[PDB]
Design a binder for this molecule. Structure first.
Ligand SMILES: CCCCCCCCCCCCCCCCC[C@@H](O)O[C@H](CO[C@H](O)CCCCCCCCCCCCCCC)COP(=O)(O)OCC[N+](C)(C)C
Lengths: 69, 175
């Protein structure tokens, strides 16, 4: 029965080791992502949570018919 | 027989008295034992001889698995999952072996009680002492872990016990 239907215990051992490693990395990545999102929403200096401003190319730098401006 | 080891399961040398009849009446149990022998013990012995002859023509071996030694939970980093998994597996194996040791001691105690007849209270109190020591150690190891036990919980319980022992020793040294 063992020869025909099942395998050795080392197979399951190493499989669950790999599964545990994968899940641990995923958990760490999730926590790091939450922290990064919080920090970049608070500060706004990151790529995410960038809100549009007024483009400076719309300004007209020419004489305005009055000397002051 | 030769199956089990005589030191793990010890027994007294089995002193038995000789028959010293004092009557001329035919003892019936001797005749019944002889009849039972001649009528039952020989056919079963022949059948066992035949079965062992068949077994001897095809013999194969199975080997007892031997496990390596891996780092335990005390030298395991807090968030290193692989080492914790290895330590947990080793701790579970040790727990099972410990339970089987307790089982062996309990079997010794039961043989103690049954074999010594009426004077069991005195003859084999050594087995009682051995079982007391073994049970106390097993209790101090795995008493109150409860369900969902782990190596970390056992380590925490041991740390609490050592802290209590250290405090008691320090207080006693101040007497
Ligand atoms: C010897 C006689 C006296 C003792 C009798 C013992 C009785 C045992 C037979 C009963 C079988 C129980 C069913 C369990 C099936 C397990 C299915 C699965 O686990 O098997 C897979 C494969 O399946 C097996 O090949 C068996 C499949 C056969 C299904 C059984 C159904 C038979 C029922 C009879 C039906 C009759 C129909 C009649 C029509 C009219 C294994 O996956 P795999 O990853 O690959 O192999 C891993 C091991 N390796 C790598 C070493 C190879």
């Amino acid at each position: 029965i063992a020869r025909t239907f099942y395998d050795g215990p080392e197979k399951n051992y190493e499989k669950t080791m790999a599964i545990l490693q994968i899940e641990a990395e995923k958990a760490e990545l999730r926590l790091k992502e939450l922290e990064v999102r919080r920090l970049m929403r608070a500060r706004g200096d990151g790529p995410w949570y960038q809100y549009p401003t007024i483009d400076k190319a719309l300004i007209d730098h020419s004489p305005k018919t009055t000397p002051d401006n | 027989p030769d199956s089990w080891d005589k030191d793990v399961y010890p027994e007294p040398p089995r002193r038995t008295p000789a028959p010293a009849p004092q009557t001329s009446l035919p003892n019936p149990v001797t005749y019944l034992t002889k009849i039972f022998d001649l009528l039952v013990d020989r056919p079963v012995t022949l059948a066992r001889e035949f079965i062992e002859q068949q077994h001897a023509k095809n013999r194969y071996y199975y080997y007892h698995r031997e496990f390596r030694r891996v780092p335990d939970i005390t030298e395991c980093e807090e968030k290193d999952i692989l080492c914790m998994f290895e330590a947990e597996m080793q701790w579970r194996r040790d727990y099972k072996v410990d339970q089987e040791i307790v089982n062996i001691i309990q079997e010794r105690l039961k043989a103690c009680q049954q074999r010594e007849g009426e004077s069991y209270r005195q003859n084999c109190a050594k087995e009682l002492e051995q079982f007391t020591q073994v049970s106390k150690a097993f209790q101090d190891r795995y008493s109150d872990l409860g369900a969902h036990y782990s190596a970390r919980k056992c380590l925490a319980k041991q740390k609490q016990r050592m802290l209590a022992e250290r405090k008691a020793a320090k207080e006693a040294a101040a007497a």
